[PDB]
Design an enzyme around this catalytic site. Structure first.
Site, PDB file in Angstrom:
ATOM      1  CD  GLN A  18      -2.730   1.221   2.492  1.00  0.00           C
ATOM      2  OE1 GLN A  18      -3.929   1.368   2.257  1.00  0.00           O
ATOM      3  NE2 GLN A  18      -2.264   0.979   3.709  1.00  0.00           N
ATOM      4  CD  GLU A  35      -5.246  -4.004  -0.634  1.00  0.00           C
ATOM      5  OE1 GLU A  35      -6.459  -4.200  -0.846  1.00  0.00           O
ATOM      6  OE2 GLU A  35      -4.717  -2.873  -0.630  1.00  0.00           O
ATOM      7  N   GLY A  54       2.435  -6.256   5.858  1.00  0.00           N
ATOM      8  CA  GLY A  54       2.700  -7.619   5.450  1.00  0.00           C
ATOM      9  C   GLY A  54       3.286  -7.729   4.060  1.00  0.00           C
ATOM     10  CB  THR A  55       2.131  -6.518   0.752  1.00  0.00           C
ATOM     11  OG1 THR A  55       1.868  -5.177   1.182  1.00  0.00           O
ATOM     12  CG2 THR A  55       0.836  -7.296   0.729  1.00  0.00           C
ATOM     13  CB  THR A 109      -0.358   2.206  10.836  1.00  0.00           C
ATOM     14  OG1 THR A 109       0.657   1.537  10.085  1.00  0.00           O
ATOM     15  CG2 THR A 109      -0.143   3.703  10.717  1.00  0.00           C
ATOM     16  CG  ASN A 159       4.611   7.266   8.096  1.00  0.00           C
ATOM     17  OD1 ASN A 159       4.585   6.037   8.132  1.00  0.00           O
ATOM     18  ND2 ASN A 159       4.331   7.956   6.997  1.00  0.00           N
ATOM     19  CG  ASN A 186       2.336   8.992   0.060  1.00  0.00           C
ATOM     20  OD1 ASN A 186       3.079   8.393   0.835  1.00  0.00           O
ATOM     21  ND2 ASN A 186       1.031   8.757  -0.005  1.00  0.00           N
ATOM     22  CD  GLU A 211      29.154   6.778 -11.345  1.00  0.00           C
ATOM     23  OE1 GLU A 211      30.180   7.037 -10.685  1.00  0.00           O
ATOM     24  OE2 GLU A 211      29.170   6.086 -12.385  1.00  0.00           O
TER      25      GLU A 211
HETATM   26  N1  LIG Z   1       4.101   7.524   3.488  1.00  0.00           N
HETATM   27  C1  LIG Z   1       3.077   6.679   3.485  1.00  0.00           C
HETATM   28  N2  LIG Z   1       3.162   5.502   4.194  1.00  0.00           N
HETATM   29  C2  LIG Z   1       2.124   4.635   4.199  1.00  0.00           C
HETATM   30  C3  LIG Z   1       0.969   4.915   3.490  1.00  0.00           C
HETATM   31  N3  LIG Z   1       0.113   3.887   3.669  1.00  0.00           N
HETATM   32  C4  LIG Z   1       0.700   2.966   4.467  1.00  0.00           C
HETATM   33  N4  LIG Z   1       1.943   3.424   4.810  1.00  0.00           N
HETATM   34  C5  LIG Z   1       2.934   2.738   5.652  1.00  0.00           C
HETATM   35  O1  LIG Z   1       2.537   1.402   5.884  1.00  0.00           O
HETATM   36  C6  LIG Z   1       2.860   1.036   7.206  1.00  0.00           C
HETATM   37  C7  LIG Z   1       1.898  -0.028   7.712  1.00  0.00           C
HETATM   38  O2  LIG Z   1       1.802  -1.092   6.792  1.00  0.00           O
HETATM   39  P1  LIG Z   1       0.416  -1.406   6.039  1.00  0.00           P
HETATM   40  O3  LIG Z   1      -0.682  -0.503   6.546  1.00  0.00           O
HETATM   41  O4  LIG Z   1       0.046  -2.855   6.234  1.00  0.00           O
HETATM   42  O5  LIG Z   1       0.718  -1.109   4.487  1.00  0.00           O
HETATM   43  P2  LIG Z   1       1.784  -1.983   3.657  1.00  0.00           P
HETATM   44  O6  LIG Z   1       3.137  -1.864   4.314  1.00  0.00           O
HETATM   45  O7  LIG Z   1       1.852  -1.515   2.225  1.00  0.00           O
HETATM   46  O8  LIG Z   1       1.292  -3.516   3.719  1.00  0.00           O
HETATM   47  P3  LIG Z   1      -0.213  -3.965   3.358  1.00  0.00           P
HETATM   48  O9  LIG Z   1      -1.115  -2.755   3.321  1.00  0.00           O
HETATM   49  O10 LIG Z   1      -0.700  -4.940   4.402  1.00  0.00           O
HETATM   50  O11 LIG Z   1      -0.228  -4.648   2.017  1.00  0.00           O
HETATM   51  C8  LIG Z   1       2.777   2.317   8.012  1.00  0.00           C
HETATM   52  O12 LIG Z   1       3.765   2.342   9.016  1.00  0.00           O
HETATM   53  C9  LIG Z   1       3.011   3.421   7.006  1.00  0.00           C
HETATM   54  O13 LIG Z   1       4.284   3.986   7.198  1.00  0.00           O
HETATM   55  C10 LIG Z   1       0.876   6.098   2.772  1.00  0.00           C
HETATM   56  O14 LIG Z   1      -0.145   6.359   2.141  1.00  0.00           O
HETATM   57  N5  LIG Z   1       1.936   6.980   2.773  1.00  0.00           N
HETATM   58 MG   LIG Z   2      -3.047  -3.135   2.301  1.00  0.00          MG
END
Ligand SMILES: Nc1nc2c(ncn2[C@@H]2O[C@H](COP(=O)(O)OP(=O)(O)OP(=O)(O)O)[C@@H](O)[C@H]2O)c(=O)[nH]1
Ligand SMILES: [Mg+2]
Ligand SMILES: Nc1nc2c(ncn2[C@@H]2O[C@H](COP(=O)(O)OP(=O)(O)OP(=O)(O)O)[C@@H](O)[C@H]2O)c(=O)[nH]1
Ligand SMILES: Nc1nc2c(ncn2[C@@H]2O[C@H](COP(=O)(O)OP(=O)(O)O)[C@@H](O)[C@H]2O)c(=O)[nH]1
Ligand SMILES: Nc1nc2c(ncn2[C@@H]2O[C@H](COP(=O)(O)OP(=O)(O)O)[C@@H](O)[C@H]2O)c(=O)[nH]1
Ligand SMILES: [Mg+2]
Lengths: 439, 429, 49, 104, 34, 439, 429
Positions: free
Chosen positions: A11, A71, A144-145, A179, A206, A228, A254
């Site tokens: 995500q 997902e 997870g991903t 989160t 974050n 982002n 480099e």
């Molecule tokens: N900068 C930024 N970080 C994000 C964002 N969404 C999720 N994250 C990061 O994702 C971390 C938590 O993992 P998840 O919510 O499971 O998102 P993921 O790492 O892509 O894994 P999954 O969503 O389970 O597939 C948080 O600590 C955030 O730092 C976003 O929109 N912007």
């Molecule tokens: Mg997700």
């Protein structure tokens, strides 16, 4: 030529990739449909977008990105978003069900049934590029991903492409804002894979982005969109050296040899300044010295890590805009004259600089202000031992009486994997303090 | 990414009917089955709860169960009765008679075959489902007995997929029967190792939610069921709508279950404002989090002073910034960390969804795994020991093929669950 | 040098414009962040059905 | 990472929460290293710089008024003298190690 | 922007000697490499 | 170059700095919007204002100041005042909770946590200031913030700036006009820090200014605005040497040595003349001799310290306007003959002269009458012991019963602080009478 | 910087209602909650006392207390009673019966949990809470007992916050209750232990103000509550508005409290004049300083001239000249050093607020830590000894389980406070 393949996993990877590609399209004047309407002053047959966009016989440009996610909601929203015609129908791989914040789930069960397809997409990306510089991987190990599938993808890319450069702008867990709860487990498990199969990893937590945007960008309620956008600005500043001309042109590989002192030492601080709102942009005479000082300030760092609690083993400044090499030397000299920030005794040089003449842009939808000059630091410091000690102490607290371990071991991961990765991080922090030690 | 739901007993059927009304309203589905929503987001993931027919009608993925056909007739004659598939109404001729034995061994068994036939047909008809949901009351006969039998058979058949059950644990102060101890114990010792996750419902807490948060005049069972429906909608919203911080049932299970037997959760909703004080309070993330962690806001009647949060999960819906939705979780985790445990740090899971429930700009559903949830188990166990010590009302259960050993094992499992919750109730630092 | 002065003036005016735009941007974000409830929030309650 | 090796000749970053709602990091100061020009290299200047001699530490030949301590009272424990774990450091030694022109 | 300055520079056609001119490579249309 | 960094601590310091920047903008023709309109009298590219106003490169000038206060009322009132556009959003630090007339609270609890970001602002000004002369700190030690936080900031400036001049224009409590009860405690506690880390400390009590305005200005009801305007006039007269052309140009550090005879003796009285109203002015021939006599007049000082009660150690007169060395030396000779003005035996010269050609400019509505010439006084005399004796006798009276000491303990002070400050004041006044004694 | 107020009992609640009317008039807030102020100074710091809602309604930061619901109902019926949030009305079913034991141990304790919940949530709603305020009557039962039980558990949670208590101590010839000495004695030690500053009120001197200064023909409790609201709003003038010399509650406490147990203040207001004498009165700083130090102007029934002023504070409001506002203090000190304590030089603190109450060119509130409070405490002590000697009305208090030993505790603590003030009065340099 000089292509860089973007790989947005998870995500967080998908969101930062959306921001990065919006910024790149604004850089190159590429409309959401994927074409340049009419440009007279910008000369025809001028292809500075080859590193991010591949041309088609119809005059349409396709980004060199792979949006890999397990997902479907985020990938489907990107599909239905503004860049329908821009993003490729393929190279946009979406699975059936999420990794459930589980590294084992993303690395052993659902990651296995999608990594082959992702690698086929990566091969279809790479065979097009005749001068591929490397792979820019965007993921968050907290989920997870981003942990498991990112680990698997990097592991197979390493053996598939040999010693190709790998820049992972990775989002590690923040000191106290989380989160998720199994986030320390995911981070500890993914760091083991990343150590072996990540050329350079970049801090992208974050809390630091939130604090920086609250203080300097002067908005009370920043969110993931602002985070982002700042990440995309940093990435564009880092990669613009191979996109535009400059006094000190630098490629992705480099600084790989300049920022990595030891094979296990590849986690790097990132800073960017002047990251200021237009409210104070005209207030401040944002000169080269001022922007360099703000970059070196730990307050302006993009991770909640303390440079003063460690020693800068190396730094790499990326000046973007009308920055003069003489001004670069002046800023470096006045930085070396400082005492609070100090280098290790075995790296007297400790400095790299790269100047690009293209000024940074301002993205509508973002809170950044237009400036004729900016600079982004990518710096290897011993301070990363602090954040890794924090996260591994959290891991020890969690794994002391084996909380949330049945979830991980059910998917198929070894129970000893937790322990063995923990000695990996123990050796990692050990070599951190011993390389920070003096002679 | 979809969930197929089942309603067991009269309580479960009424709660499921209210839940389906809420879901149909959210997705813009009128009782005749058509769609009148004014957004593409309602159609993009309407397949989670509804299956499209040849004519475009959206049939809910629902299986209805009760030995009494009276509630079947009532639910099909209700305002949203025509929505459900006619063949999914599965009922018997004679009621369960408030007997777990009758609903689990004698009369439930003769109907569970067709029940599993219907559920298997629906599960294979739909593509790749996140899991199964069930709604029932543990103090009843068929809601507890047939509900637990259904859970056992579905664990036999689909262990791959998640299992979520909404069990209405009775309270002595709401008790409208006498066999609450027997039925509740015989159901909980099943759900401990059968249901993947089981959040708790108490009508005692549902009543004074309508007072300390709603201050409404006439609270009825239909009034109570809307709270359960809203929390279900908030739980499964992220599967149906996009969000900055996405989550699903497996994500909540991983983040809220540290050990397999500790899967009973305490649940709440926010905002809960009264009509008189609607305009007085200014709803914001701070107020939402304060209402989440307010003791009186819980819809299960166990006191959270006497226990410590094993884990917590906040499922936010609406339009809010991310740093102030994580900073309030940090704020509570700091302000009242005595609610939390040190060996599991950073106990709060968070999710963000862009689509709030109808009538809210911000909303949130709170699911907590606390060591205080064993208070209801302790009180039900005390009542169970009082009743079973003198063999009261045991001839009814023993005449339906059940033995005293089932009650003994149920008591043993309940005591084990209570003890393993009470392990971490001590406020260690 | 005087033309660079002119371009710095132009950047200053552009910064005026961006600051104003961010001002109404933040105002609109606050307006959307504010939470309110209409009748359908209560329509399920206070009815004896 | 022990303070008494990390900050042998540097002010430790005394942490304060205000300025952040999140974990505070640190704040760089304007403390300048004394003049250590490379041996034989010319005084090459790309741009105007702050002269080191104009920022010579006040603890240079600071007179000892109490016979043994350049510090007047225990505000040295607030400005000069810092406690770093099990060790105590004083920046009054900086004046001893520097010259009258801020040179080692 | 750098239009009249460039025009007067090319009209004056100063010979290439250090000190007389500066910022020539900053006086550019765009920096897109080919 | 030759910039000066202004710091304004507390309510008194913030309001004094407000008046000072009023006067500076009037002198340099800078509008509240921050821009200088074209004027024929002042030539183009005449950057004489940069000693106080950094030029942003876009036609705007930002003051080189830092308004530091722990209580948001004064800084917010400035932010909503006339110069909201002039003043930077930063260097305008707002606290959330006041020190509440407590030196211990301002020096050990809230000062300890606001002073490092105050130093951030100070450094972000100093790096821009290429030729910084020194720090001019305005505060009142009788309050809590101005005493505690002011002392802490001035104390931590020493380590990270070295020999930079520290001009502390401090408002000490007056013998009768008292707006606090713990004012003797705050003054005594902050006096040691002033002694240790103040290069030149100028006496600016309120009762003397009130009496001066009542007598010379024919103003029956002056106020803080009047006293702040007079303080700003004195500050501008002292700093005009490094801003405008002058016969005897002096800097902040030039009068440092000539005013400080011994390391612990740097407290100094000040005065100004001709401090007269418009009605008063056109009846007097305000010549250099007349203005010098009015300066040396015992009624004319800005502090309630009578010079006839002690020996003059080092006088310094800053003349401004059409003043002539002829006239200044005739005035000095007449003053030396005038025999209540007796210099100590070991300092025969005892006189410093700084002549600047720029006459003072009056603010609209100011009570000062516009004059062609005006002389300011900064003079160290042994009579300074008067105010220290009265203040530490008040301290003794309060400390006999240990009253109000529970507050200072409750915000983190040990009574060792009180004790050592007591004998430090006693030894200071002993030094005063000791240097006053003949050889 | 925010202060949240709690008004307890019949007296405290009506005083708080009048105070909130005064504050709403100050900030231009009509009873419906909208803002119709004529200047933006009333809007800049409106967050000090009011919290904005979603619709812009400014809810007072107020918590209401009683055991008799009639006080809540009358407050709601009040002209500005529609301002308060409906859930902030916390009340019981049976009154305290002027019994401190019921107000502090049985009825208050069983009710104070929700009170603390409301106070905690509203305190956390504040960005940075400056302090807590309380308004109650010591003579009453629910005002004294419940208010003391409030401050006891608020001091523990917020040790550093300013406790701003307004206690109405009964007067002998104004008394209308016989157990008033008992309640006052039991509440004095609680006030000593758990109040940063306790500023006493007495109806004797309030009626003195109404009858001699204002020449009102028939002053009811409304006029007394208006006089109390005067100082209650004037103590925070520098908090809510700018000024030449700002201050706050903590600055007042540090300048008025030389020792922790000496924090009982006797107050006053100016200007105050009768209707017929108001056109003859020329408002000036001299007139304000004349009226602020007048013994008759004091709203305490303790003669200022008998004791000695430990500390004094002048919260002046309006546009006035600073050297004269300071000179009216230094001059009175110089010519009346006998009225001030010698070993505390410069007994008077002066603070200037920019904005006076609208319609007044300038006003002033006087805060005095005079050593004459021991006389009005000793009167209560004499009454308490007289009643306690013969076990008068002890059975009512011991019915709830409170103890003769605790009566002796209260008596000893009050005697210690009285002798503390006496010893600091007669101590010399
Ligand atoms: N900068 C930024 N970080 C994000 C964002 N969404 C999720 N994250 C990061 O994702 C971390 C938590 O993992 P998840 O919510 O499971 O998102 P993921 O790492 O892509 O894994 P999954 O969503 O389970 O597939 C948080 O600590 C955030 O730092 C976003 O929109 N912007
Ligand atoms: Mg997700
Ligand atoms: N000359 C002059 N003195 C002032 C002015 N304002 C306040 N003061 C002095 O400051 C004293 C009050 O204490 P301050 O130092 O201002 O208080 P503060 O700096 O805000 O710090 P706190 O006491 O913690 O609030 C008064 O006795 C005055 O003598 C002013 O405008 N001009
Ligand atoms: N919340 C809620 N609770 C209900 C409802 N109907 C019954 N109950 C509760 O369920 C208990 C009786 O369970 P019952 O309906 O007999 O279970 P069954 O025999 O399986 O149908 C009572 O104590 C009620 O409190 C309802 O519509 N909503
Ligand atoms: N000033 C003032 N005093 C009041 C008011 N109401 C009651 N009192 C005083 O309070 C005393 C009785 O207090 P009581 O009503 O028993 O307090 P409660 O039991 O807490 O409600 C009487 O002696 C009155 O003089 C009021 O509105 N204003
Ligand atoms: Mg102040």
């Amino acid at each position: 030529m000089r292509e860089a393949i973007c790989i947005h996993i998870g995500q967080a990877g998908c969101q930062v990739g959306n921001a990065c590609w919006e910024l790149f399209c604004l850089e190159h004047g590429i409309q959401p449909d994927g074409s340049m309407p009419s440009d007279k002053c910008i000369g025809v047959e001028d292809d500075a977008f080859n590193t991010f966009f591949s041309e088609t016989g119809a005059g349409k440009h396709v980004p060199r990105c792979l949006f890999l996610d397990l997902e479907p909601t985020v990938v489907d929203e990107v599909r239905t978003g503004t860049y329908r015609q821009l993003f490729n129908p393929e190279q946009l791989v979406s699975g059936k069900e999420d990794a459930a914040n589980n590294y084992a789930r993303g690395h052993y069960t659902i990651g296995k049934e999608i990594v082959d397809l992702a690698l086929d997409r990566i091969r279809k990306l790479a065979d097009n590029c005749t001068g591929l510089q490397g792979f820019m991987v965007f993921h968050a190990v907290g989920g997870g991903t981003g942990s498991g599938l990112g680990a698997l993808l990097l592991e197979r890319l390493s053996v598939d492409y040999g010693k190709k450069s790998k820049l992972g702008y990775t989002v590690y867990p923040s000191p106290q804002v989380s989160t998720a709860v199994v986030e320390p487990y995911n981070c500890v498990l993914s760091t083991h894979s990343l150590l072996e199969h990540t050329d350079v990893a970049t801090m992208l937590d974050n809390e630091a982005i939130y604090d920086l945007t609250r203080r300097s960008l002067d908005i009370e309620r920043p969110s993931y969109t602002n985070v982002n956008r700042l990440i995309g600005q940093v990435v564009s500043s880092l990669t613009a050296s191979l996109r535009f001309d400059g006094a000190l042109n630098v490629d992705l590989t480099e600084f790989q040899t300049n920022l990595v002192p030891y094979p296990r030492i590849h986690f790097v601080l990132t800073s960017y300044a002047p990251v200021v709102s237009a409210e104070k942009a005209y207030h401040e005479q944002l000169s080269v010295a001022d922007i360099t000082n703000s970059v070196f300030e730990p307050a302006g760092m993009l991770t909640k890590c303390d440079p003063r609690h460690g020693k800068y083993m190396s730094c790499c400044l990326m000046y973007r805009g009308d920055v003069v090499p003489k001004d670069v030397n002046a800023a470096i000299a006045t930085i070396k004259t400082k005492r609070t920030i100090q280098f290790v005794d075995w790296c007297p040089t400790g400095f790299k600089c790269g100047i690009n003449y293209q000024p940074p842009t301002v993205v509508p939808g973002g809170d950044l202000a237009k400036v004729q000059r900016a600079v982004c630091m990518i710096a290897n410091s011993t301070a990363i031992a602090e954040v890794f000690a924090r996260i591994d102490h959290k891991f020890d607290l969690m794994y002391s009486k084996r909380a949330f371990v049945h979830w991980y071991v059910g998917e198929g991961m070894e129970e000893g994997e937790f322990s063995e990765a923990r000695e990996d991080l123990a050796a990692l922090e050990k070599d951190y303090e011993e390389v920070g030690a003096e002679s | 990414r979809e969930i197929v739901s089942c309603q067991a007993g009269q309580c479960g059927n009424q709660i499921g009917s209210k839940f389906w009304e809420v879901i149909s309203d959210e997705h813009g589905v009128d009782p005749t089955g058509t769609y009148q929503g004014d957004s593409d987001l309602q159609l993009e993931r309407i397949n989670v709860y509804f299956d499209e027919s040849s004519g475009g009608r959206y049939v809910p993925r629902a299986v209805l169960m009760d030995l009494e056909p009276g509630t079947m007739d009532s639910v099909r004659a209700g305002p949203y009765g025509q929505l459900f598939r006619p063949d999914n109404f599965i009922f018997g001729q004679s009621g369960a008679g408030n007997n777990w034995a009758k609903g689990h061994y004698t009369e439930g068994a003769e109907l569970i075959d067709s029940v599993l036939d219907v559920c298997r047909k629906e599960a294979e008809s739909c593509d790749c489902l996140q899991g199964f949901q069930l709604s029932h009351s543990l103090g009843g006969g068929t809601g507890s007995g047939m509900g637990t039998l259904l859970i056992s058979k579905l664990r036999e058949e689909y262990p791959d997929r998640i299992m979520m059950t909404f069990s209405v644990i009775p309270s002595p102060r709401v008790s409208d029967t006498v066999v609450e101890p027997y039925n509740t114990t015989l159901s909980v010792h099943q759900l401990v190792e059968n249901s993947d996750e089981s959040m708790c419902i108490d009508n005692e807490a549902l009543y004074d939610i309508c007072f300390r948060t709603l201050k409404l005049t006439t609270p009825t069972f239909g009034d109570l069921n809307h709270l359960v429906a809203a929390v279900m909608s908030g739980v499964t919203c992220c599967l149906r709508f996009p969000g900055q911080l996405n989550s699903d049932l497996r994500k909540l299970a991983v983040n809220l279950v540290p050990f397999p037997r500790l899967h009973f959760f305490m649940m709440g909703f926010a905002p809960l404002t009264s009509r008189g004080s609607q305009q007085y309070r200014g709803l914001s993330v701070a107020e939402l989090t304060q209402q989440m962690f307010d003791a009186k806001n819980m819809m299960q009647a166990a006191d959270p002073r006497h226990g410590r949060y094993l884990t917590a999960s906040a499922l936010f819906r609406g339009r809010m910034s991310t740093k102030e939705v994580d900073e309030q979780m940090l704020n509570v985790q700091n302000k009242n960390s005595s609610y939390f445990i040190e060996w599991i740090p950073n106990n709060i899971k968070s999710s963000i969804c862009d689509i709030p429930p109808k009538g809210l700009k911000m909303s949130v559903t709170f699911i907590g795994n606390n060591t205080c949830i064993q208070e209801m188990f302790r009180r039900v166990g005390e009542q169970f020991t009082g009743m079973f010590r003198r063999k009261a009302f045991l001839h009814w259960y023993t005449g339906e093929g059940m033995d005293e050993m089932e009650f003994t094992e149920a008591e043993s499992n309940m005591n084990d669950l209570v003890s393993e919750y009470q392990q971490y109730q001590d406020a260690t630092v | 040098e005087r033309e660079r002065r002119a371009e710095r003036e132009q950047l200053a005016e552009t910064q005026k414009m961006q600051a104003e735009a961010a001002a109404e941007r933040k105002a609109q974000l606050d307006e959307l962040y504010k939470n309110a409830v209409d009748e359908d929030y209560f329509k399920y309650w206070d009815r004896c059905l | 990472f022990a303070p008494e090796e990390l900050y042998k000749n540097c002010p430790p970053p005394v942490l304060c929460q205000p300025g952040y709602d999140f974990t505070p990091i640190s704040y760089n100061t304007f403390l300048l290293n004394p003049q250590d020009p490379p041996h034989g290299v010319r005084s090459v200047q790309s741009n105007f710089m702050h002269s080191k001699c104009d920022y010579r530490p006040r603890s240079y030949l600071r007179p000892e008024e109490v016979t043994g301590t350049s510090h007047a009272s225990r505000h040295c424990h607030c400005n000069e003298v810092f406690q770093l774990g099990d060790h105590t450091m004083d920046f009054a030694c900086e004046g001893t190690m520097v010259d009258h022109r801020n040179r080692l | 922007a750098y239009a009249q300055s460039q025009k007067m520079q090319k009209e004056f056609r100063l010979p290439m000697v250090p000190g007389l001119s500066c910022g020539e490579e900053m006086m550019r249309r765009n920096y897109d490499r080919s």
